[PDB]
């Protein structure tokens, strides 16, 4: 009966029925987004009213709508007509992926471009990329997708090995017309194939790898109740799933003695964008918001035991809605398991003669998604010592282009004539904090060097300083690796036995943030990505760092708009938004399929406990 | 027959015999350091001549000597008398540890200080700390150790919980004299105990942890031949061990097709220092060079199966010399095993319909050492994809002090009246490079942001630049996380199939470097720690960033002196010295025994291979 339970297939079908009966789901309508709404602040309202938020698209051109329904009472709470030119277009539909290639296949301009390159139209795949907002005035208010071509020689061929450069087209997916076809010139289509399962490329397979058996004879140490409530080594939380954000962690708390102490109310990857840095007009508009525009959760893969998740795994199979309101299950889309994590603590004392060693462990909650050529793994880890960590694993196939004759300062060569445009993968972790409760504050902590002189005659002293962020206008911070800058979230009203406010310290990887010029469209639409850390006052409707309707929005939505309210965040219900990402200059080693690369962050207890919380761990 | 084989007990006995025969090892002599010399460059000597280098201390006060012998020819190649007042004192002997407490036990000044604090001398442990170089004129030419006191209530009591602040003494361990006893005032000695094995503090042990079974039915995938030659998943290397540096990796190479391609000739942690940032006269002189002053390899722990190393482990038991030249085996001092490392590569393609997933693995080579209150784990990892990584794990018990009533800017409070002085743990990895051979060069790579305008009208472009470090004078570099700065070691004479010099990219963690004032004694003695990366031209006698003799040695040797030669490093035999470390502001969670914290670096192939090197990994 948990208010945080995963949505059932029945609830989805109930939303469908409510919408249809209300006359909001005609033949021309499509569900572009559907998700359950979290419980509002305050549980004083016995029996939670299960509500769902829905974005309804109209393939007829009619205005779309945002609808909220109660599956509990079978009613439509609200239905608001959207003006996309003002607030943004709805997320891209999977069924729209094919329309780009299909429409172009009958366009004379496109056909002429392909004929000139001697490419059989039946073998040309077209990637349906988001449009963004640029200098095309005729696109405002229109639902546009841009297409880039790749050649697939045969059904099982990897089209990514054969990009068709110097060509790009724009299509209005609703009116079903090709608005523009740009051909800047012919570029040879890379000839080598990139079929990583082809023996001629892989060569003889290795026979040297001996098996590694990971098992748990007595089963896992964690328990799963209510379908998604996890309890493991003092940790307690609920594993939620949203079609847009993917896996979401709720009510992260730690059992310290006789009390369950909250740490984070809600943790999620609220956005992830991949901005490309190639100035060619064929790709200079390319910026794909995996989360906001495509909805990464809907493309979650079914994870195979022994391949994707090794060991004793407990799966969760979330249900989402298809474009028509029918429930669709993502079988084994979420993996949960615990794993050994080396040494936790160790000391051999010369005076006491006592030799002490203890092992560490981590609870893993993960899912893997695929968006076109990219595949991303999202991993959340809980450690015995109280540490919380997130790790993203980027793999898949690199987005390609031709490698220019004469070289390039924005593309790397991965194969003869094959290029890989420079780009970044930037994530935004939204952490609705609740350190021992909702009354929290954030302090920026910098290392402080000291000058040799009075009080520091030997010049060995060094210190640290903490600055409380009191208002949102001063809560947009940048990293500073050189001064070991971190951010501490504490509760000024809850102190440890040393009379110090309890807290948690966020450690960032300090990777570069958005590189695009400050005046670029992407810098405006993905403003969150320009700074490492933002702190806002909690608000029900402030869900994503980029706003609710990212697709084709002019910019400034999300964080920049939230921060503009300049609200008090000193000892209040606050939310931390951490930006982190990878800057990718593709290597030859990334081709034909790339080895996983990683990025993330972690939070470690900072005077949260009265002493080490792992003194009760056995020797085993 | 391998000239990279581990030293044998016989070789050590042979060195002892040769030294004795030469009249260099009488009863007053002690072996402060003994290690095998790596073979010189180029296949000079027809056969391999095994040579050892030794530092001989004299307990009577006579001048020590540095000697090199050939165990093969039974001869002394060279023996030089050392002027310690100039070139530095020899490493501290384990037998000198107890000397400090013993001498102070009968000193009236020391006894009076303890009496003033109502402390029973029989229960006062004294830590033998390195002295460094400060303003004490009498210390010139004297072998000094400074002592800090801790109370041990009973045999198995953790003395670290009871520091005796406001008191420090200096001792000449050779003349057996207490040179000075400094008492700045009586501080309350913290009363709470820190016995992490006492049920009173641990409380009832958890019974919730289920077992995790990690086994290899068919044994490990790696082979060990010639005692220390490792071959695993295309990797080839020799595992060496030196009493000073600990585990050292030799001839790291990768089998690419039909050729064994070298990558790194020698990899080691050539120094590690722990500088304290408390300006109190009681500890302002404290800087412990675990590697250079104490010799970390000497204190390597015997690792227990199931506790220290889990899974199918292959052990190495290196042999070192004791203070008299007799061989001593460190049973199971080195652990070697392979472990699963999640997903290696993955892609589910929407056009080919092919779903592909491969798992990763890494070879692990490690050891764990203990120096007083600290315990450090040194880990080297080799990945299937060609990545090489080092990870240091810091744990043990924090060095304590009293926590001043009025608070402190350089000490944190761990328990009532118990303090933990701020400090850093800084390592120096010496990487004698050999990317496809010895003709190498280093380039500093920075991300390059571009301004919106002609050629970049949309302001989305971003690039990078590489700067070749041509001479040592320009090879002292700093990190720049903001611009994603990395360093690439390449071979200008060996190109991949795309006609680009093969290379490897070093990724640093970009943690703060030495914080001490540039004019401090430690900034001079640990000069290497003030910069993130140094590149030198290979030279036989340039082994450590701090020189051969660190104990009580001023600046003047090491990296700063090496770089002064301003040698050509552009396409030459070069060595990369990377500084990396942790800045520790102790938390309550670190008491009474600290959870492991980590730091390290890694190098990934950068155009070294002609495509991904793991296409031949099987699905199962
Ligand atoms: Cu990428
Ligand atoms: Cu420390």
Pair (A212, A65) in one structural domain: no
Which pair of tokens denotes residue A153? Answer: 């020689």
Determine the number of helices (DSSP H) and then strands (DSSP E) in chain A: 7, 34
Cis, peptide link before residue B620, omega less than 30° from 0: no
Subunit contact A210:B221, Cβ cutoff 8 A = yes
Residue A404, chain B, CB below 8 Å: the answer is no
* Cα angle A381, A382, A388; round to 5: 85
- Interface contact flag, B204 A616, Cβ < 8 Å: yes
Residue A310 in contact with residue B359, Cβ under 8 Å? yes
* Under 8 Å between Cβ of B180 and B131: no
Cα atoms found within 13 Å of the Cα of residue A427, Cβ hemisphere only: 26
> Can you read off the two tokens belonging to residue A570?
């000193």
> Would you say B281 and B187 are in contact if contact means Cβ atoms under 8 Å apart?
no
Beta bridge partners of A183: A167
- What is the Cα–Cα distance from A545 to A115, expressed in whole angstroms? 44
Distance CA B10, CA B185 (A): 54
For residue A74, the distance in angstroms to the closest alpha carbon of chain B comes to 37
Both B109 and B72 in a single domain?
no
Residue A225, chain B, CB below 8 Å: the answer is no
Interface test with B, best of A92, A152, A216, A349 (most B CBs within 10 A): A349
For residues B587 and B511, membership in a common domain is answered with: yes
Q: For residue B368, give the CATH number of its domain.
A: 2.70.98.20
Most B-contacting residue of A135, A458, A529, A607 (CB-CB within 10 A), to test interface: A458
Spatial CA neighbour of B375 closest among B167, B123, B160 = B160
d(CA A551, CA B277): 52
Cβ distance A461 to B277 less than 8 Å, yes or no, reads yes
CA distances to A12, A64, A330, B455 from A32, in Å: 14, 10, 17, 37
> Resolution for this model in angstroms, one decimal place?
1.9
How buried is residue B493: exposed, middle or buried, by Cβ count under 10 Å (0-12/13-18/19+)?
middle
First to last CA, chain A: 36
The H or E element that residue B492 is part of is: strand B486-495
The closest CB to that of B156, out of A219, A354, A393, belongs to: A354
Q: Judged by CB atoms within 8 Å, which residues 14-43 of B form the interface with A?
A: none
Where is the domain boundary, A170, A195, A220?
A195
Asked if residue A464 has a cis previous peptide bond (ω within 30° of 0), the answer is no
- How far away is chain B from the Cα of A512, in angstroms, using its nearest Cα? 5
Max Cα distance, chain A (Å): 86
Give Cα separations from A443 to A205, A263, A446, A489, B459 (angstroms).
53, 16, 10, 7, 34
Q: Is residue A427 within 8 Å of A581, Cβ to Cβ?
A: yes
Burial of A42 (0-12, 13-18, 19+ CB in 10 A): exposed
Which among B276, B393, B463 has CB closest to A460?
A: B276
| Residue A97 backbone dihedrals phi, psi, to 5 degrees | -55, -50
Measured distance CA(B137)–CA(B180) in Å, rounded? 12
Beta partners for residue A81, in sequence order: A65
Q: CA B62, CA B25: separation in Å to the nearest integer?
A: 13
Q: Which of residues 561-620 of A touch B (CB under 8 A)?
A: 583, 585, 587-596, 604-620
Query: Residue B266 in contact with residue B253, Cβ under 8 Å?
Result: no
The kind and range of the H/E element at A602 are strand A594-606
Picking from A359, A459, A595, the nearest residue to B385 by CB comes out as A595
Non-local (6+) Cβ contacts of B454 within 8 A are none
Alpha carbon of A17: minimum distance to chain B alpha carbons (Å):
31
Number of C-beta neighbours around residue B475 at 10 A: 24
CA of B336 to the centre of ligand 2 (A): 27
Q: Give residue B281 CA to ligand 2 midpoint distance, Å.
A: 20
Tokens of A118: 């001697």
The alpha carbon of B193 and the centre of ligand 2 are apart by a number of angstroms equal to 20
Strand partners, B148: B127
Residue B559 φ then ψ, to 5°: -45, -50
User: What is the distance between the alpha carbons of residues B86 and B79, in angstroms, rounded to a whole number?
Assistant: 17
3-state secondary structure of A336: strand
- The answer to whether residues A524 and A494 belong to one domain is yes
Asked if A484 and B522 come within 8 Å (Cβ–Cβ), the reply is no
Which residue is listed with tokens 């050189």? A482
In this structure, are B500 and B544 located in the same domain?
A: yes
Between chains, do B609 and A588 touch, taking CB under 8 Å as contact? yes
CA dihedral A85→A91→A97→A100, nearest 10 degrees, is 10
A162: CATH: 3.10.450.40
How far, in Å, CA of B126 to CA of A399, rounded? Answer: 63
DSSP B572: B
Task: Give, as one character, the DSSP assignment of residue A205.
Answer: P
* DSSP codes joined into one string, A279-331: -STTTTT-EEEIIIII-GGGGBPPPPBTTTB-SS-EEE--EEE-TTS-EEE-T
| CB burial of residue A499 (10 Å; 0-12, 13-18, 19+) | exposed
> Minimum-distance ligand to the CA of A596?
1
Q: In sequence order, what E strands does B459-616 have? A: 462-469, 476-477, 486-495, 501-508, 533-537, 574-584, 594-605
Q: Please give the DSSP secondary-structure letter assigned to residue A373.
A: T
Counting one residue from A and one from B, how many pairs have CB atoms under 8 Å apart? Answer: 450
Nearest to A445 by CA among A505, A500, A501, A535: A505
**What six digits make up the tokens of B169?**
């003494």
CB–CB contact A595 B360 (8 Å): yes
Question: Domain ends where: A87, A109, A135?
Answer: A87
Chain A interface test: which of B275, B351, B490 (most A C-beta within 10 Å): B351
Q: Give the per-residue SS3 of B77-135.
A: EEEEECCHHHHCCCCCCHHHHHHHHHHHCCCHHHHHHHHHCCCCHHHEEEEEEECCCCC
Determine the residue of chain A that is closest to B419 in CA distance. A498
Dihedral, A565, A568, A570, A571 alpha carbons, nearest 10: -110
CB-based contact A202:A193 (threshold 8 Å): no
If asked whether residues B26 and B43 sit together in one domain, one would say: yes
Could you tell me which residues come within 8 angstroms of residue B392 by beta carbon, excluding any fewer than 6 positions away?
B269, B272, B376, B377, B378, B379, B425, B427, B598, B599, B600
Find the closest chain A residue to B512 by CA distance: A482
Q: Check CB contact under 8 Å for B460 and A279.
A: yes
**Are A317 and A434 contained in the same domain?**
yes
> By CA distance, what is B521's nearest residue in A?
A458
Q: ∠ CA B428-B431-B435 to the nearest 5 degrees? A: 155
Q: Structural domain tally of chain A?
A: 3
B449: which DSSP letter? E
Q: What are phi and psi of A568, to 5 degrees?
A: -70, 125
- B contact residues 154-183, partner A, Cβ 8 Å cutoff: 155-159
Q: Say how many Å lie between the CA of residue B374 and the centre of ligand 2.
A: 8
**Cα–chain center distance at B38:** 19
B57, B84 Cβ separation under 8 angstroms:
no
Would an 8 Å CB–CB cutoff place A377 in contact with chain B?
A: yes
Q: Is the peptide bond before B592 cis (omega within 30 degrees of 0)?
A: yes
Q: Any idea which ligand is nearest the CA of B397?
A: 2
Looking at the structure, tell me whether residues A356 and A443 fall in a common domain. Answer: yes
Residues 496-555, chain A, touching B (beta carbon < 8 A)? 496, 498, 500, 510-512, 515-523
What 3 state SS string does A83-144 have? CHHHHCCCCCCHHHHHHHHHHHCCCHHHHHHHHHCCCCHHHEEEEEEECCCCCCHHHCCCCE
Whether residues A65 and A139 fall in one domain: no
Question: CB distance B125–A279 less than 8 Å?
Answer: no
Contact A458 B279 (CB under 8 A): yes
The size of chain B, in residues, is 620
Q: Which of B176, B195, B214 is the last residue of a domain?
A: B195
**Residue B347: enclosing H or E segment and its boundaries?**
strand B334-348
The count of C-alpha atoms lying within 13 angstroms of the C-alpha of B319, restricted to the half-sphere facing its C-beta, is 15
Q: Tell me which residue range forms the domain holding A580.
A: 196-619
Contacts of B135 by beta carbon, 8 Å cutoff, 6+ apart: none
Helix (H/G/I), strand (E/B), else coil: A159: helix
DSSP bridge partners of A151: A124
Whether the Cβ atoms of residue B578 and residue B431 lie closer than 8 Å to each other = yes
Please give the distance of CA A245 from its chain centroid, rounded to a whole number. 6
Q: DSSP letters along A437-486, please?
A: SS-BEEEEEEEEE--SBTTBTTS--EEEEEEEE-BGGG-EE---GGGT-E
Chain breaks in chain A (C to N over 2.5 A) after: none
Distance separating alpha carbons of residues B177 and B190, to the nearest angstrom: 30
- For residues A419 and A561, membership in a common domain is answered with yes
From CA B107, how far away is CA B169, in angstroms rounded?
10
Instruction: Calculate the alpha carbon distances from A275 to A29, A178, A424, A526, B506 in Å.
Output: 31, 24, 6, 9, 25
> How far is the alpha carbon of A285 from chain B, nearest alpha carbon, in Å?
8
DSSP count for chain B of H helices, then E strands: 7, 34
Claim to verify: residue A83 and residue A118 sit in the same structural domain:
no
Asked if residue A326 and residue A285 are part of one domain, the reply reads yes
Q: With contacts defined as CB-CB under 8 Å, which chain B residues touch A482?
A: 479, 481, 510, 512
């Amino acid at each position: 009966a948990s208010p945080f339970r995963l949505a059932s297939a029945g609830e989805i079908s109930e939303v469908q029925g409510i919408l249809r009966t209300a006359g909001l789901l005609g033949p021309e309508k499509r569900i572009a987004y559907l998700g359950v709404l979290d419980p509002a602040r305050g549980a004083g309202s016995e029996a939670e009213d299960r509500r769902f938020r829905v974005f309804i698209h109209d393939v007829s051109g009619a205005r779309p709508q945002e609808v909220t329904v109660s599956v509990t009472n079978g009613t439509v709470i609200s239905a608001v007509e959207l003006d996309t030119a003002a607030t943004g277009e709805l997320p891209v539909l999977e069924e729209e992926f094919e329309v780009v290639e299909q429409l172009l296949a009958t366009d004379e301009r496109w056909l002429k471009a392909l004929a000139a390159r001697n490419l059989d139209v039946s073998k040309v795949r077209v990637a349906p990329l988001s449009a963004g907002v640029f200098e095309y005035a005729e696109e405002r208010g229109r639902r546009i997708l841009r297409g880039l071509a790749f050649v697939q020689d045969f059904p099982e061929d990897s089209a990514w090995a054969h990009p068709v450069d110097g060509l790009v087209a724009y299509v209005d997916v609703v009116s079903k017309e090709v608005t523009r076809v740009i051909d800047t010139g012919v570029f040879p289509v890379p000839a080598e194939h990139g079929n990583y399962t082809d023996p001629e490329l892989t060569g003889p397979l290795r026979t040297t790898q001996k098996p590694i058996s990971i098992t748990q004879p007595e089963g896992p140490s964690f328990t799963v109740t209510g379908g998604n409530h996890i309890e493991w080594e003092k940790w307690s939380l609920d594993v939620g799933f949203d079609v847009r954000e993917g896996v979401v962690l709720h009510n992260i708390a730690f059992r310290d003695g006789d009390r369950l102490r909250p740490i984070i109310n809600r943790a999620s990857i609220a956005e992830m964008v991949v901005p490309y840095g190639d100035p060619s007009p064929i790709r200079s508009w390319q910026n794909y918001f995996a989360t906001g525009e495509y909805l990464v959760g809907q493309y979650a893969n079914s994870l195979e035991l022994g391949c994707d998740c090794l060991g004793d795994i407990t799966y969760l199979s979330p249900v989402i809605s298809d474009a028509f309101g029918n429930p669709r299950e993502i079988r084994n889309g979420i993996c949960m398991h615990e794993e050994d994590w080396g040494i936790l603590a160790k000391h051999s004392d010369l005076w006491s003669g006592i030799n002490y060693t203890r092992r560490n462990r981590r609870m893993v909650i993960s899912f893997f998604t695929t968006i076109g050529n990219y595949d991303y793994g999202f991993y959340w880890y809980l450690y015995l010592d109280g540490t919380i960590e997130f790790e993203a694993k980027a793999t898949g196939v690199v987005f390609t282009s031709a490698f220019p004759e004469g070289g390039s300062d924005n593309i790397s060569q991965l194969a003869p004539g094959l290029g890989a445009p420079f780009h970044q993968h930037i994530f935004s972790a939204r952490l609705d904090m609740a350190i021992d409760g909702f009354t929290n504050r954030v302090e920026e902590e910098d290392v402080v060097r000291q000058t040799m002189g009075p009080g520091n005659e030997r010049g060995n002293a060094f210190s640290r300083k903490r600055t409380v962020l009191t208002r949102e206008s001063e809560a947009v911070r940048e990293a500073d690796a050189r001064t070991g800058r971190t951010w501490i979230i504490s509760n000024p009203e809850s102190k440890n036995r040393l009379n110090e406010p309890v807290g948690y310290k966020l450690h960032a990887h300090n990777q570069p943030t958005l590189l695009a010029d400050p005046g670029s469209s992407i810098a405006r639409r993905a403003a969150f990505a320009t700074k490492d850390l933002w702190v806002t006052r909690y608000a029900d409707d402030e869900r994503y760092p980029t706003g609710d309707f990212v697709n084709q929005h002019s910019g400034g939505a999300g964080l920049p708009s939230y921060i503009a309210q300049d609200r008090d965040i000193d000892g209040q219900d606050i939310v931390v938004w951490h930006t982190f990402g990878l800057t990718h200059f593709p290597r030859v080693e990334d081709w034909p399929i790339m080895p996983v690369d990683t990025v993330g962050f972690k939070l470690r207890p900072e005077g949260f406990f009265d002493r080490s919380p792992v003194l009760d761990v056995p020797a085993n």
